[PDB]
């Protein structure tokens, strides 16, 4: 089989120099008409082409970022590299190593994509979240919605459950967003109005990287 495998640092700070590696197997950087490129994707955003390199050391670059971009290869190890200098939060993305050949026979098309390596550019230190309960406002209806707010954490992820996971339906846990610097996430749980405040409810928020585990009981006002 032909496999491409991307390795990166996971996390670097702005201004720093990103170094990606693509380790190739099941074909060589050595045939005439052979190439490997880099395409990237921020989360919930599109694909951007970055650079491409050929068997004959010819290189193509995205003009937007030519001053920050250097692409190279090592035909012996079958590897290709990408270096991106003076990175910033905008360069937060998944980076894919893709194969593309100049010739029809070998592959004039991105047929083979690796799984991608996530690269997070952040100045942030490890930071524990604050876990706020969200009680309904001061009734008269069938459903009541409770919420939980997890604010100011780094890195990802937090996990969130309601009553240790024992309450699993009517839940909505939203993707993390950036404020700073730092992540915020929120979750809502909708239960039948007879349930709460009679039967208690608690969001259970873990943030592994700070060793944080917070159980926050939704108290009625």
């Amino acid at each position: 089989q032909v496999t491409l495998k991307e390795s990166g640092p996971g996390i670097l700070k702005p201004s720093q120099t990103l170094s990606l590696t693509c380790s190739l197997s099941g074909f060589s950087l050595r045939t005439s008409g052979m190439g490997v490129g880099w395409i990237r994707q921020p989360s919930g955003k599109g694909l951007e082409w970055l650079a491409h390199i050929w068997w004959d050391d010819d290189k193509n670059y995205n003009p937007s970022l030519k001053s920050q971009l250097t692409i190279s290869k090592d035909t012996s190890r079958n590897q290709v590299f990408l270096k991106i200098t003076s990175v910033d939060t905008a360069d937060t993305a998944t980076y894919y190593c893709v194969r593309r050949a100049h010739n029809v026979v070998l592959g004039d098309w991105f047929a083979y994509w690796g799984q991608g390596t996530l690269v997070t550019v952040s100045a942030a230190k490890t930071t524990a979240p604050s876990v706020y309960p969200l009680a309904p406002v001061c009734t008269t209806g069938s459903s009541v919605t409770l919420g939980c707010l997890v604010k100011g954490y780094f890195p990802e992820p937090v996990t969130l459950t309601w009553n240790s996971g024992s309450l699993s339906s009517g839940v909505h846990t939203f993707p993390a967003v950036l404020q700073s610097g730092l992540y915020t996430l929120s979750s809502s749980v909708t239960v039948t109005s007879s349930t709460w405040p009679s039967q208690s409810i608690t969001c259970n928020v873990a943030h592994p990287a700070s060793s944080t585990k917070v159980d926050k009981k939704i108290e009625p006002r």
Binding site: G46, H52, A111, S130, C138, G147, F174, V177, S186, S188
Partner: protein, 219 residues
């Protein structure tokens, strides 16, 4: 740059229907060597994109014949004869002719369902957050369809546009609705200075907005 405009950016289908996706380029994507390097990619959630079609209409090995690509010059179309459940995801067109190589923004192949109005819930700052010196007001807008929604925050009857963070869920796989969280984050000082807090949502399912409010002082 060659701009790659996909139409639509959201394609609601029912399984079994015919789906067509338009890609139009701002320049001819014919290379000097005679070939038109127009490609189509499908990205399923949490996977890497896959090649479906190369040079306008060539299906890549193992892509089934329900997919076809057509067109010429600047105007291109991907067509799905009968849409399967496995075909949902984001479809990109791509021109490999001119530097920089460019993708379209992507077209999300999503499920049709009946319209569903949002359940709006608004939540004041916790005491816990306030003892810290910040103040976040939260609005959940859950289980609505279609995805198009306009949410504004109002403080004492007037619109607020700075400090608002938004997060959307993908289409639910069990009921096909969408959901959204909106957080107005203020300083506690600011929160104690104002009284009336409103989150309002205008959704096609009603002529008038869904309004959810609270007054700080009554909490």
């Amino acid at each position: 740059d060659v701009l790659m405009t996909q139409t639509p950016l959201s394609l609601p289908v029912s399984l079994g229907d015919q789906a067509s996706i338009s890609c139009r380029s701002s320049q001819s994507i014919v290379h000097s060597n005679g070939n038109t390097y127009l490609e189509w990619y499908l990205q399923k959630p949490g996977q890497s994109p896959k090649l479906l079609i190369y040079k306008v209409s060539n299906r890549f090995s193992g892509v089934p014949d329900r997919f076809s690509g057509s067109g010429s010059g600047t105007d291109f179309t991907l067509k799905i004869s009968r849409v399967e459940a496995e075909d949902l995801g984001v479809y990109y067109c791509f021109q490999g002719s001119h530097v920089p190589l460019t993708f379209g923004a992507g077209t999300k192949l999503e499920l049709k369902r009946a319209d569903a109005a949002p359940t709006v819930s608004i939540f004041p700052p916790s005491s816990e957050q306030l003892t810290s010196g910040g103040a976040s007001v939260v609005c959940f807008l859950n289980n609505f369809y279609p995805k198009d929604i306009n949410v504004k925050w109002k403080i004492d009857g007037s619109e607020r546009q700075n400090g608002v963070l938004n997060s959307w869920t993908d289409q639910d796989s069990k009921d096909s609705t969408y959901s959204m969280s909106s957080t107005l984050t203020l300083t506690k000082d600011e929160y104690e200075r104002h009284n009336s807090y409103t989150c309002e949502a205008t959704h096609k399912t009603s002529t008038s907005p869904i309004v959810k409010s609270f007054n700080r002082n009554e909490c």
